[PDB]
Each structure stands twice: as structure tokens, then as C-alpha cells.
Amino acid sequence: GPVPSRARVYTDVNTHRPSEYWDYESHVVEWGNQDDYQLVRKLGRGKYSEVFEAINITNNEKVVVKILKPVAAAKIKREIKILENLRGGPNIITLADIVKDPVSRTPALVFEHVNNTDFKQLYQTLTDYDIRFYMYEILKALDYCHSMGIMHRDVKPHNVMIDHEHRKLRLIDWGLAEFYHPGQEYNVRVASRYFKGPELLVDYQMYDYSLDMWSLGCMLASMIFRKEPFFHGHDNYDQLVRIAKVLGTEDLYDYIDKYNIELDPRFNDILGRHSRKRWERFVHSENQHLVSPEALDFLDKLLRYDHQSRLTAREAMEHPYFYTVVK
Ligand SMILES: CCc1ccccc1-c1ccc(CNCCc2nc3ccccc3[nH]2)cc1OC
Numbered sequence: 001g002p003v004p005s006r007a008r009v010y011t012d013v014n015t016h017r018p019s020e021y022w023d024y025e026s027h028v029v030e031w032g033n034q035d036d037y038q039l040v041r042k043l044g045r046g047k048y049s050e051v052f053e054a055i056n057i058t059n060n061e062k063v064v065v066k067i068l069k070p071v072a073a074a075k076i077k078r079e080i081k082i083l084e085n086l087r088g089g090p091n092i093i094t095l096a097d098i099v100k101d102p103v104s105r106t107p108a109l110v111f112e113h114v115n116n117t118d119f120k121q122l123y124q125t126l127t128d129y130d131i132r133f134y135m136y137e138i139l140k141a142l143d144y145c146h147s148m149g150i151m152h153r154d155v156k157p158h159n160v161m162i163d164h165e166h167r168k169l170r171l172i173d174w175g176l177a178e179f180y181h182p183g184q185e186y187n188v189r190v191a192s193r194y195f196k197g198p199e200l201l202v203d204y205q206m207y208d209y210s211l212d213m214w215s216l217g218c219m220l221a222s223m224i225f226r227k228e229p230f231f232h233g234h235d236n237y238d239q240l241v242r243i244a245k246v247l248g249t250e251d252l253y254d255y256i257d258k259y260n261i262e263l264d265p266r267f268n269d270i271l272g273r274h275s276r277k278r279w280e281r282f283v284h285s286e287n288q289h290l291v292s293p294e295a296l297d298f299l300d301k302l303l304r305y306d307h308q309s310r311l312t313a314r315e316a317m318e319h320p321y322f323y324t325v326v327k
Helices: 072-076 076-086 128-147 210-225 236-247 247-258 293-302 313-317
Strands: 039-045 049-056 061-069 093-101 107-112 160-163 168-171
Touching: 039 061, 039 076, 061 072, 061 293, 076 093, 076 107, 076 160, 107 293, 107 313, 128 160, 210 293, 210 313, 293 313
Parallel strands: none
Antiparallel strands: 039 049, 049 061, 061 107, 093 107, 160 168
């Protein structure tokens, strides 16, 4: 069967932790008082969540309330444990309370207020410097969670809140996050189609933190090339094809051979044969102000089929692309 794989960094962090840290099913949820909060305005919406702006009437401070739909509610213990474990980490949203509506019996997560700039889904809104600066901020959150033994598994623009006035960012929606345990096989039905790594698309279950790095590379490519999304798959099978049209089928086959991965027969008629493209092909007059040799080099080192070859979050922070960012 498939060749086993392990993360090349933070491999055994969970193994060294007491079971209460990662054994989320054993966690006992202490419920707060839902009557401590009054809803003020709607901030946004997710497929399995409703997000509102609220006031904690006990201290008159603004808070963010995330009401959970049944599928999100079933994995509450995991999301709570992960949020509590990461609380106080750089650029991680801060869980303030956990409440339950006695009327609808639905749970909600309360977070400390996050000043959120509404970009209104307009992504041609950042300069080259700002892209580097905010990518560095995302990397701080990813290196932190990976160091704590957690993979986000849903990195995308929707899960990143930016306070553009104070130049601060938060990585949010940890509902799909999981604890990394070497040799564990995970569900590949994670993330959002456009941000899924090749490991998920080829059903390779022994993945790790590097999955997040692929997703981050998808975000970067969409931003520097002004192409939303960068890999525009019609479905999960076509998603790999779109990837293969850029990275090439040769390296894809080398990847599947390395890990002795059995490809699903639908791909036979759809993958074809494609040359690996040079990143310079996506450079045009409308996006040249966002592209530099350092950006293309950095992107190249994230968007690799082989999850073990991609830069880790800390290696990415060392990249020359970030030398211009004030630290
Ligand atoms: C790091 C900048 C960046 C670089 C590359 C590609 C994209 C971006 C980028 C990332 C995030 C955002 C803003 N995302 C807000 C999403 C959001 N608002 C919510 C309100 C309520 C509930 C949930 C929400 N979720 C903009 C970006 O570029 C302009």
C-alpha cells in the first residue's frame, strides 16, 4: 500500500503532551452564560456558521459571536480544545466563551473583538509591500499552530481577518483543524476545493502541517497574479487537472510513484500529459507591480506536489521575499 510519511518539523510535539491537550473527546465543556451577550450586527457568514458582532453586557466590550450549525456543532469539542490550546498565540483568534441557546439548543463560540476591514471580496486592493507584510503575519500564525501540533486544514482568504487600519491580522475558523500525530491517517475531505493540496486530491491520508503551506501558496498565487482562484477546478478531479496544467504531469507522477499512491481511475482520461509551466507565464502588465523574482521563487517553493518538499512555515519566514518587510 502507500508509503508512510511524517512531518519533517514538530513531528512528535503531541506525543510529548499530556493526553488532556490532544484527546479532545475527553474534554469537559464548561458553558458560559448566553445572557451575558447582546447581538449588535451581522459581520458575515460561513457554510456551517453565522457570525455576529455582540456586546458582553458584563463589561460593555465588543465581542464576536459564531453560532454553529449541526455539522460544526458535532465537532465542537475539537474546535474548543484547539482554540484553547492556541489562545494567546500570534495572530490566532481568541476564544472568550462558549455558550448555548436554550431556545434552539445550538452552541456558539464567543471571541474577543477583532477589528475587521471589510474588503468586500475585492482582492486587487493590496500593494506588493502589503502582500508581503500580511503573508508574514499569516506565517506567524501557521508556525505557531504547527509548533503546537495543530494543522489548520482550511487556510483561505475567508479564514483570515485583517484590521487594515492597525495592520493586524487573525487566522480564524479552526473548525476543520486537527492535532498532528505521526503515522495517523486523516480524512481528505478538508479545506475548500480551490485550496486543497494534491495529497487530498489523490487520497493520501497521512498528511501533515505542509497541507497548510500548499493552501497558503494558492492564496499567494491568486494575489500576485490577480487570478481568483488560481487553480479553478470545476470539481475535486478537475482540481488536480488544473494543478497538473501548471505544475506538469511529470512531477505528479514522480510524487504518486514516491509514495506508491494508487490513483483513482477517473484521472486516466482526464489528466493527460502537461508540461510544467514557468511562473513568468502568469505575469502581465496588470500584475507586474506584485511580481518579483523573490515572489516567484517563494511561490515555487510552496506549490510543490511533494508535501515533504514544501517550505515549512518557519523556512518560509526566512525567505528573501520577506527581507523588505520591517521586523
Ligand atoms: C493576507 C492578504 C491576502 C494575500 C493573498 C490573498 C488574499 C489575501 C486576503 C486575505 C483575507 C482578506 C480578508 N478576509 C476576510 C474574510 C472574513 N471576513 C469575515 C467576516 C465575518 C465572518 C467571517 C469572515 N471572514 C483579504 C485579503 O486580501 C485583500
